[PDB]
Amino acid sequence: AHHHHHHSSGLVPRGSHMANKAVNDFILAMNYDKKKLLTHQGESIENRFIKEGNQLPDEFVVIERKKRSLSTNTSDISVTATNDSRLYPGALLVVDETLLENNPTLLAVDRAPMTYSIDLPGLASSDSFLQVEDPSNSSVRGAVNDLLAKWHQDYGQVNNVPARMQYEKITAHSMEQLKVKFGSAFEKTGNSLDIDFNSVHSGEKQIQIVNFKQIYYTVSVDAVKNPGDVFQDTVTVEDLKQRGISAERPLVYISSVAYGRQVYLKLETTSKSDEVEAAFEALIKGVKVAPQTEWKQILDNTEVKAVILGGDPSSGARVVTGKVDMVEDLIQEGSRFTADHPGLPISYTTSFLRDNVVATFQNSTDYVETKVTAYRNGDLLLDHSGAYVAQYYITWDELSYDHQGKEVLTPKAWDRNGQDLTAHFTTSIPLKGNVRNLSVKIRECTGLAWEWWRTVYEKTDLPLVRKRTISIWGTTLYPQVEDKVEND
Incomplete structure (x- = not known):
């Protein structure tokens, strides 16, 4: 470079092509370690515990405590909020601990027109594409909600357009353990689930937590050719630095959002049996077998709490309670997708703005596994x-x-x-x-x-x-x- 494409002032005019070029050069010149930026670890504990027996009212429990470690590496981020205007397709997010903690920092600046693709069984190849002039939460949601109306009446009348069900179950031991399994956003739902951890640790109860994800549709963003293509020419380098953007705190964009229904299920029982795993697993499938006593005893002393995100009417989170019969219909509620079902974000994926590389998060923690043996x-x-x-x-x-x-x-x-x-x-x-x-x-x-x-x-x-x-x-x-x- 030199004189050409430069103003005689030596300054870069706000709202010019040179400003967007400076921004583009600014992002491309960033050097950072991808893995180190997206790495978080929880509790670290020693590995020596005692064997202990506690006398319960009608039982003697032998409790074995052992150190276990949980490690996950995933690019998908679970959503446990509903009024979140930050989580729209194309949204620019800042890479710091707020991103790892699932409370993202949104880079709200003048945005350039962005093109969106949406996967739907009935939508033709040509009609799937979508262009938004000023991508924000309101803008993208509008264009998507508008497109759903056209598709629903045209094709969406064929009923069997089944939601994609996904099962994630895990034995509960600690809050840090569950955050690794379900994401840091789980702490909000974990506080409304009322997970009794002391009782699990003392051998009083056994808790199992189940995910349920049903995905109606997903909206995507094509690869960003140039980092500066995402901004308007009014966006300037000193504006990004004013908001603390650098190689130490780079930018990421939401490349895909999953829309649908999500349920978090909690099953805690006072049973110390080791067929509890078999009883809960048999329950979820709704296939209650015909014996009268062998499994019904633990189940009748098992009581259930749930959290529902999505489904019928767009209102956010529903907390429901019961014992066992209703579990079969919870899965059945979102089985069919209707325009009556608005569907809301349950999962999203991010990619680095500089080179469209998908951001993967490394999470780990040490947790104390609790094993229990009871004698009546x-x-x-x-x-x-x-x-x-x-x-x-x-x-x-x-x-x-x-x-x-x-x-x-x-x-x-x-x-x-x-x-x-x-x-x-x-x-x-x-x-x-x-x-x-x-x-x-x-x-x-x-x-x-x-x-x-x-x-x-x-x-x-x-x-x-x-x-x-x-x-x-x-x-x-x-x-x-x-x-x-x-x-x-």
Whole structure:
């Protein structure tokens, strides 16, 4: 360069071709590391935890805690807001922590005409294109909403234009963990979902979270040939610097926006079973099998909360609640796309303005995975109705855990051991879930001088069933025993 294409003033006139050229040269001369700019990491924690047991009202839980790491690399960004005027196709966003935190900084400057393509089953190749003179949230939304009307009446009457369903499920352990899985924008929906994390950590409940995305249509932007093509000539280099744009804080443009319906489902249960994964997964498909008790027990102690974005009327977020029957219809609500369904942004993708390279975000965190094993409390019932004097010898161990996680077995005994008991005698011995090595011996006095005692019942390591009833009866010479187990 030199004199030509330059004013004699040495200045670059606002609203001229030279200004747009200076801007174009300014963006192209930017040097930055793509990956470092879009990298964020959450909590970092040590990897040594203790084994612990806690006594619940009706259960003894053994809790194992282990460090796990979550890492995701994706170019798609989930939307959890509805009144967001920043998230329109073609919008220029600033690359900083606000972008990673899913609270973007919008570069609102005089914009040049931009062309948009929209994918729809009925729209012909030629009719899909769309030109907006001054791309803003109102402008692009108008042109899209206008085009939907023409398509709906023309072709959109064929009903089976099914939404694209997408499933994302994950076990909940921490907020940081969920942000990595669902994006940093999840914290808004996570606050309305009421995720109880302490109870998961204490082994009280197990929580699973499900995504549901149904995409009606997506609006796209063609590749930007020159970085300056996006601005009007009124936009000047000193204007971009005034707004803090540089190689350290470069520019990105929303290249695609997904429009449709989105549901966030939360399933927390007090069940400690390890078929919880199978119960929730079977539930989502609505295929409740015919057994009466095996899965219904956990489900009836499972209660559900949901958050709905999109669907019928354009009003933003709907929080719904119930148990299980309604889950099947939530998926069914947005199955069909109508013009009655406006559809709203649920996901968008960004590309760097300088070279149209799609921006990928690297997110990671350490989280404490919680594993739980429960042991139900039980009862030991004794009934003596025999024609003799009987003696009981009932012993067991109580499992406890050390400060360093060692197993501790504390010997226990019925306080009535060895005592002469006579009919009719009954008692109930409450046994907590941490009871191990339960042994029950029963002897009876025969009254015979040469063999005073007769063993009547002797068992070791008796399983801790819900209700066990040992009943003895009969006579000195012919004692009778019954061991009845009630478990369900």
